[PDB]
């Protein structure tokens, strides 16, 4: 039976770097406010030119190129994201209530203590429902129901600009972020997500055969092979790793404090992915048996105007500041998954 991961879209400001992120917020205001009406490199700066963008150069200056966009909404987003990545690699040594207000299954209660929790820099805090139980029947009373807080005010205003929970449905023993079947839920609604699984058999046989070595514990899958291959190219060309990917045992995450031209390196390799120059796609096969999840979703307003007096008390019971909530019903659509072959 497949799992589901919920991510809040609101990453933290880790205490070890709290001052540096304030420096970046100040710098970002100084820039946007110019284009329109302390280790961080203040010269990797936004420019109005493509119509707006930012330049990247070689370690001695010399060669340079611009990433440029039709609109500032894209340029500011990506530029701030680059500087955010440039900070988080500095500190710490990878060190570290919930947004799940309530959970239930078939009348039973459940809590965050029963989920598995982790973070990812661009998706925020994440929880895995990790159900070891077997689906009894179709219908909502036989799948989980979850009530979730969407943190509309304290979003980091430049890093990500969506209001809603991200849903990722995936198999057992998978990291959720690669090959993400990312569905999303608006605040103030109840989303009824029904899951159907398709499988295909024919390639790398569950990890047996040819591979490029992986950098995290998982079932083998093509996307993970591409990610580790990209990280290998990054590390072997520029002796540091990119932050949104796992880190080889002998590497360091890139930052201007030690790798003063890493942006040029990264975005040229990423352009090789944009134009599909990289060798990884030829190195990495599909699994010899594989499955994909297909979601059919209905949505409705929640809570009703008359029963809204309840969610106010559910927030008060948790003492939370404060429609702001969302609800997700997750249904396993049919006991009818079967393989496609020949």
């Amino acid at each position: 039976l497949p799992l589901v991961t919920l991510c809040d879209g609101n990453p933290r400001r880790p205490s070890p770097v709290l001052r540096h992120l304030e420096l970046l917020d100040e710098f970002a205001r100084e820039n946007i406010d110019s284009l329109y009406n302390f280790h961080l490199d203040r010269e990797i700066r936004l420019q109005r030119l493509v119509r707006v963008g930012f330049r990247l150069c070689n370690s001695t200056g010399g060669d340079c190129f611009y990433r440029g966009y039709t609109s500032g909404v894209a340029a500011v987003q990506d530029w701030y994201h680059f500087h955010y990545v440039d900070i988080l690699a500095l500190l710490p040594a990878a060190w570290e209530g919930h947004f799940v207000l309530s959970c239930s299954y078939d009348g039973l209660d459940c809590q965050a203590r029963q989920f598995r929790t982790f973070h990812h820099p661009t998706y925020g805090s994440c929880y895995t429902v990790d159900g070891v139980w077997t689906a009894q029947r179709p219908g909502i009373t036989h799948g989980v129901g979850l009530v979730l807080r969407v943190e509309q005010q304290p979003h980091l205003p430049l890093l990500s600009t969506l209001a809603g929970i991200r849903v990722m449905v995936h198999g057992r023993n998978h990291t959720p972020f690669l090959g993400h079947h990312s569905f999303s839920v608006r605040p103030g609604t109840e989303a009824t997500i029904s899951i159907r699984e398709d499988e295909v058999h024919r390639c790398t046989a569950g990890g047996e055969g040819v591979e490029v070595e992986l950098l995290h514990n998982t079932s083998y899958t093509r996307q993970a092979c591409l990610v580790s291959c990209f990280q290998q190219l990054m590390v072997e060309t520029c002796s540091c790793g990119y932050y949104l990917h796992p880190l080889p045992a002998g590497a360091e995450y890139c930052s201007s404090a030690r790798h003063p031209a890493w942006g040029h390196c990264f975005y040229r390799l990423y352009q090789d992915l944009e134009t599909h120059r990289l060798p990884c796609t030829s190195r990495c096969p599909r699994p010899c048996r594989e499955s994909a999840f297909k979601l059919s979703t209905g949505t409705s307003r929640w809570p009703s105007a008359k029963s809204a007096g309840w969610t106010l008390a559910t927030l008060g019971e948790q003492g939370l500041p404060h429609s702001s909530l969302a609800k997700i019903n997750i249904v396993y659509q049919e006991l009818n998954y079967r393989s496609v072959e020949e």
């Binding site: 039709t70 600009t161 209001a163 079947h181 990312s182 569905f183 608006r186 020949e342």
Partner: protein, 421 residues
Amino acid sequence: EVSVSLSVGFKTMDFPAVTICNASPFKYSKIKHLLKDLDELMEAVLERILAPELSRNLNFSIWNHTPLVLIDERNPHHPMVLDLFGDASEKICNAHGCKMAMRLCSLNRTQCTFRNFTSATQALTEWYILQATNIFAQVPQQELVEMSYPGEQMILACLFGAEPCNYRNFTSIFYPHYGNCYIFNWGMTEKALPSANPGTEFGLKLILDIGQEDYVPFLASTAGVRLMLHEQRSYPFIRDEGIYAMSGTETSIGVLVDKLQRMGEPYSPCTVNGSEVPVQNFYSDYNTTYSIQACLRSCFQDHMIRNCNCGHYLYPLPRGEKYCNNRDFPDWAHCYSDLQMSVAQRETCIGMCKESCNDTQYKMTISMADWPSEASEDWIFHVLSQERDQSTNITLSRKGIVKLNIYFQEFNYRTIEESAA
């Protein structure tokens, strides 16, 4: 014998042609120099139904084309058929025995038939659509194409993969039910671009402006961008294939190309390229490929030209004919309603158009989130307002903006193919 082969997975290929239309056919601030008199009459019809006691010197030559009549049959031995104008309180009846209808006519109005509704909302909507069609069909298209939403206004930002994009990169067409429609990656005038990676990072990213404050109030009942995916060089039948995208919302559409290829006549009746079918296609001057809906919509126009001596507004027109309108063809409303409601016509055309051997389809997965979030609105809309590259209308409407992401899904390719045993 025929063997069914199949395959599924991911493959680099030409990204689907995407087409973008605003739900309103025209900008009310520009088209209202024609629709002034019809709107001045429509408001009076509404006042005659909703609050009669408030009920000047209207244009009844618009009304006498196809007047609405009240019909009430709650006195079975003697029904009363009653025109709303030219007439114990003053109320129109809405009871279970009351109906509302359009009195379509022909032959110096010596023969007539009623198109019949149970609800004033449908009656008024259909009456206004027919009257506005009569109005529009008299305007030359070279001018009518300039009273709808320019791409310069509507496509507010665009980005494919990481390559720049803007309005002049779309091929424009006038689709008479929707006004100007803009087609991306159509693959006709230039080579089409491929997409080699799955996920939104490598799809099409759009910000669009629905000018809701400027919709035609009696035509544009729905607010959104009408949206469709289709293969290169084919015509977008956006009326029945089209998705909607909602404003104030980031819509993400994951695409799976799901083809089915058949053999042809010695194993199945399909046609490979349409050179063989009995009926010529009036979409020839778009230079698009053959498709059965193009063939059906050319049956209908051919039979309209055959019966009424004019062609209807919603379809192309062979170079010799005229569009139906009340000045030249007084009987066109009745003559068109017959063909529209005749199921026998649909049957005899489906018996005349052979369907294509390549059944190609896009199995979209649609996802939505509120955009922009509360914390970012105040800078996103300032940025977008400050770079419209036009010197007018500074006030970018905050409740009219859409954002689209269209991308190839994790599995983007599925194909079924017939093969000879």
